[PDB]
Amino acid sequence: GMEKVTVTLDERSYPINIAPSLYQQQDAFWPLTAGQRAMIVTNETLAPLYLHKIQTVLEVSGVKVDSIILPDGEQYKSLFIMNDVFTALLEKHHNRDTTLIALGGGVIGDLTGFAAASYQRGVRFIQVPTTLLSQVDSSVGGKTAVNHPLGKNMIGAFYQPASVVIDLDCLKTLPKRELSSGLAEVIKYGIILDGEFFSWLEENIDALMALDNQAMAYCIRRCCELKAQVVAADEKETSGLRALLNLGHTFGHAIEAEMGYGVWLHGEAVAAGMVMAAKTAELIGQFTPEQTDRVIALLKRAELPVTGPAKMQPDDYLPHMKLHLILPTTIGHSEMRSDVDASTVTAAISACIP
Amino acid sequence: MEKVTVTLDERSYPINIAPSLYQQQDAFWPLTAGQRAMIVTNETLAPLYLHKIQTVLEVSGVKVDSIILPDGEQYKSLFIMNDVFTALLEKHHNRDTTLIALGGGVIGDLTGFAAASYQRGVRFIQVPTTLLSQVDSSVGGKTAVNHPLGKNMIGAFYQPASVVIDLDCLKTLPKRELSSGLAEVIKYGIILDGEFFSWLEENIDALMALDNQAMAYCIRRCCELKAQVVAADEKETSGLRALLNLGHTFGHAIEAEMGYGVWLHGEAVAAGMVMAAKTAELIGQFTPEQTDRVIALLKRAELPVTGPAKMQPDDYLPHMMRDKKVMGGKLHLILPTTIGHSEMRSDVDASTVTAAISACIP
Numbered sequence: 001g002m003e004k005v006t007v008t009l010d011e012r013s014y015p016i017n018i019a020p021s022l023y024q025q026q027d028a029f030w031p032l033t034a035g036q037r038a039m040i041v042t043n044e045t046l047a048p049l050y051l052h053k054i055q056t057v058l059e060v061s062g063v064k065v066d067s068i069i070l071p072d073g074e075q076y077k078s079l080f081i082m083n084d085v086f087t088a089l090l091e092k093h094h095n096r097d098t099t100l101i102a103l104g105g106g107v108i109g110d111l112t113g114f115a116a117a118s119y120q121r122g123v124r125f126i127q128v129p130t131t132l133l134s135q136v137d138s139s140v141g142g143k144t145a146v147n148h149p150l151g152k153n154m155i156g157a158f159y160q161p162a163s164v165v166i167d168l169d170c171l172k173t174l175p176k177r178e179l180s181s182g183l184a185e186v187i188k189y190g191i192i193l194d195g196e197f198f199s200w201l202e203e204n205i206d207a208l209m210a211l212d213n214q215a216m217a218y219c220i221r222r223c224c225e226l227k228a229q230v231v232a233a234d235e236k237e238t239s240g241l242r243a244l245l246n247l248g249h250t251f252g253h254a255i256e257a258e259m260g261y262g263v264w265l266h267g268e269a270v271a272a273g274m275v276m277a278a279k280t281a282e283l284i285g286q287f288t289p290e291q292t293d294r295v296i297a298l299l300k301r302a303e304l305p306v307t308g309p310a311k312m313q314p315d316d317y318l319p320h321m322k323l324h325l326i327l328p329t330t331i332g333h334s335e336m337r338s339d340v341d342a343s344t345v346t347a348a349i350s351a352c353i354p
Numbered sequence: 355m356e357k358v359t360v361t362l363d364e365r366s367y368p369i370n371i372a373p374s375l376y377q378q379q380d381a382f383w384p385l386t387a388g389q390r391a392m393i394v395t396n397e398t399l400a401p402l403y404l405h406k407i408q409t410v411l412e413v414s415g416v417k418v419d420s421i422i423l424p425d426g427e428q429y430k431s432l433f434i435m436n437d438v439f440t441a442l443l444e445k446h447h448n449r450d451t452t453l454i455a456l457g458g459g460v461i462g463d464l465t466g467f468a469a470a471s472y473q474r475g476v477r478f479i480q481v482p483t484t485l486l487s488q489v490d491s492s493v494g495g496k497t498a499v500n501h502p503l504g505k506n507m508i509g510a511f512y513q514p515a516s517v518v519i520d521l522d523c524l525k526t527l528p529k530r531e532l533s534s535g536l537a538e539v540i541k542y543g544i545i546l547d548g549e550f551f552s553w554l555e556e557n558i559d560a561l562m563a564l565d566n567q568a569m570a571y572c573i574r575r576c577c578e579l580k581a582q583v584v585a586a587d588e589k590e591t592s593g594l595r596a597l598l599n600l601g602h603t604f605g606h607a608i609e610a611e612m613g614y615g616v617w618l619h620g621e622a623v624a625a626g627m628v629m630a631a632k633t634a635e636l637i638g639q640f641t642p643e644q645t646d647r648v649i650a651l652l653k654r655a656e657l658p659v660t661g662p663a664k665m666q667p668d669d670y671l672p673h674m675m676r677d678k679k680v681m682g683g684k685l686h687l688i689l690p691t692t693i694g695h696s697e698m699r700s701d702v703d704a705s706t707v708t709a710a711i712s713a714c715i716p
């Protein structure tokens with residue numbers, strides 16, 4: 001079906017529209033209108049699949065389109081690459097009324113967003129996310145950035161899109177491993193914020209894996225709804241409410257750091273991380289094995305790992321991680337708990353060794 | 355000590371102005387003991403003021419790192435800004451750090467955008483060391499770096515936490531740069547406050563001599579005036595803020611044709627304001643007596659009131675049009691209406707512009 005989320009943050013409002021074949025609808029790329037310009041930023045993987053189609057629809061609507069195609073990879077989320085986007089914009093004489101269109105995943109999304117924030121101190125930005133992860137995570141919060149060699153996402157801006165266009169057909173070309181990686185973050189929302197959504201996932205996860213339009217549209221809509229509610233409740237990260245979004249990410253970062261880029265995908269590491277966080281919550285005396293087993297079972301349904309790499313030992317995790325962890329309190333409720341003992345965390349990691 | 359409080363885009367900050375302010379109690383508020391700062395400066399200012407400022411901060415309990423960048427508009431680049439990020443990350447500066455911009459407007463813009471972008475925004479304090487940056491950069495929140503295809507094309511609106519103006523720093527500023535700053539001082543009087551203009555006619559000698567009491571009042575009032583115009587035209591579009599471009603359309607032509615550093619920005623603005631005055635005479639809104647007052651005061655500040663001998667009227671016009679597209683070619687000018695009042699005039703005839711330029715040929 002067609003789902004729609006209106007997000008209202010920092011006194012902005014924008015729509016997220018979600019439907020199969022959305023790229024082909026009239027005014028799907030609103031607020032762009034006839035006579036205006038757009039610069040599509042995409043990567044070498046997405047370009048042959050969607051760039052021509054999108055350019056055609058925009059140009060039939062009176063919109064003048066330029067494009068820049070970047071290589072595929074996290075390493076291109078760079079200040080030097082963002083400068084090349086500025087060069088493309090300036091070489092084609094794009095003025096402050098241009099719109100940047102991020103056609104791709106979260107890598108493209110982050111780089112383009114920061115480019116839109118910074119070009120002439122801010123031009124309009126439309127997200128066209130093509131991974132499940134970016135549909136359910138990047139589409140809300142306004143975080144844009146590029147990397148520095150000494151820290152990921154260290155250079156950037158809070159900058160909100162004018163609209164987010166989610167055509168579910170784009171998921172038909174997404175590798176299944178990337179689809180599952182996105183579903184780790186989908187499941188996370190259920191654990192941290194909405195136990196009823198978790199139950200809905202238990203009942204519909206097979207349809208999501210099959211790219212069912214009705215399930216996936218609702219799935220995306222609810223994740224965005226949940227994310228927008230938590231960002232709205234602490235837009236300046238006052239409380240630790242936005243921090244809850246990091247369930248499994250402390251453990252997961254350790255895995256990504258030791259294993260290297262593309263070896264474990266982000267959502268795969270987060271999946272194993274959520275289990276380790278659940279086990280931690282059991283050991284401090286606040287979670288039951290039955291609750292943890294529900295998290296484990298559902299992750300396996302989504303074809304996600306629930307064990308750590310055999311290749312790392314527990315002592316390899318902690319240098320990457322006295323300790324601040326996001327822990328579940330129920331299925332549907334969570335907390336930031338600081339001062340967790342390292343031996344508690346290592347015991348939890350040890351319980352997930354294959 | 356003068357103080358201006360500025361409140362724009364729901365932020366509020368003080369601009370404090372005094373001789374020997376670098377040495378005074380809580381001069382770098384809101385930085386407080388136990389916090390970190392990274393001072394960004396250039397190779398010219400570093401031997402003059404970096405040690406002094408570091409000492410005062412460290413005596414206040416503030417932990418200080420610094421980076422020294424090369425001096426010049428040609429270094430106001432994304433790539434040089436990247437070195438700031440590297441210095442911050444190498445010393446493990448977290449989101450609670452403060453960037454201190456110690457230098458002129460070039461340092462101020464690059465540091466400001468660095469502060470806007472580092473971890474998506476850290477605190478920023480301005481320590482402007484040119485008159486131009488004291489009276490122009492200190493309000494508005496425009497930060498930026500240049501791209502080879504356009505000046506100030508990459509940046510952010512980002513306001514400082516405070517602006518620290520120690521008048522003593524002007525004692526080392528070259529006299530030509532002091533005059534260039536006084537062009538923008540005089541502009542304020544023309545566009546917004548005729549009583550300030552009259553005060554300038556009575557005090558310009560003291561300002562040229564760096565009199566502390568005059569200069570403190572001069573800087574306070576300019577910041578006040580710029581803040582009033584920006585605050586009114588934040589939520590309105592149109593362009594009350596565009597009034598800040600008096601003389602800048604003519605002046606950009608001069609800077610563009612004469613080349614980098616040949617005419618300083620305020621020298622070009624000076625001659626531009628005269629041309630704008632002449633234009634306002636020719637459309638029937640200004641008198642020669644009014645224009646004469648502008649000319650006389652500019653000369654007292656050692657600024658030009660004529661265009662370069664090398665440029666003819668047709669050399670100005672391609673630079674003054676919004677662009678050269680078929681639907682472009684339009685000359686939009688800020689004109690004075692009195693001494694103290696100004697307006698945007700759209701679609702000014704080329705013959706009027708050529709006559710006004712011609713009236714200022716040496």
Ligand SMILES: NC(=O)c1ccc[n+]([C@@H]2O[C@H](COP(=O)([O-])OP(=O)(O)OC[C@H]3O[C@@H](n4cnc5c(N)ncnc54)[C@H](O)[C@@H]3O)[C@@H](O)[C@H]2O)c1
Pocket residue numbers: 043045046072073074077104105106107108110130131133134137138139140141142143144153170171172173174175178266
């Ligand atoms: N709030 C935020 O701004 C936010 C949130 C989470 C993640 N991020 C950032 O997002 C990035 C990760 O994003 P991602 O997981 O979407 O990875 P990604 O953008 O690298 O895309 C994953 C892979 O799938 C390819 N791909 C994408 N869409 C496709 C499609 N429809 N068909 C075929 N292949 C396709 C990409 O080319 C790439 O090879 C990280 O840089 C992360 O920091 C940002």
Ligand SMILES: NC(=O)c1ccc[n+]([C@@H]2O[C@H](COP(=O)([O-])OP(=O)(O)OC[C@H]3O[C@@H](n4cnc5c(N)ncnc54)[C@H](O)[C@@H]3O)[C@@H](O)[C@H]2O)c1
Pocket residue numbers: 396398399425426427430457458459460461463483484486487490491492493494495496497506523524525526527528531
């Ligand atoms: N609102 C804004 O953000 C805004 C407004 C006006 C100008 N600007 C920018 O400011 C820049 C021009 O600034 P500027 O005129 O200060 O030039 P500048 O920063 O290049 O300084 C002029 C010269 O004086 C030297 N210097 C500065 N202070 C000194 C002192 N106390 N003693 C000895 N030498 C000193 C500098 O090192 C430089 O050589 C431009 O890039 C312009 O875009 C921005």
Ligand SMILES: [Mg+2]
Pocket residue numbers: 185249266270
């Ligand atoms: Mg994540």
Ligand SMILES: [Mg+2]
Pocket residue numbers: 490538602619623
């Ligand atoms: Mg100026």
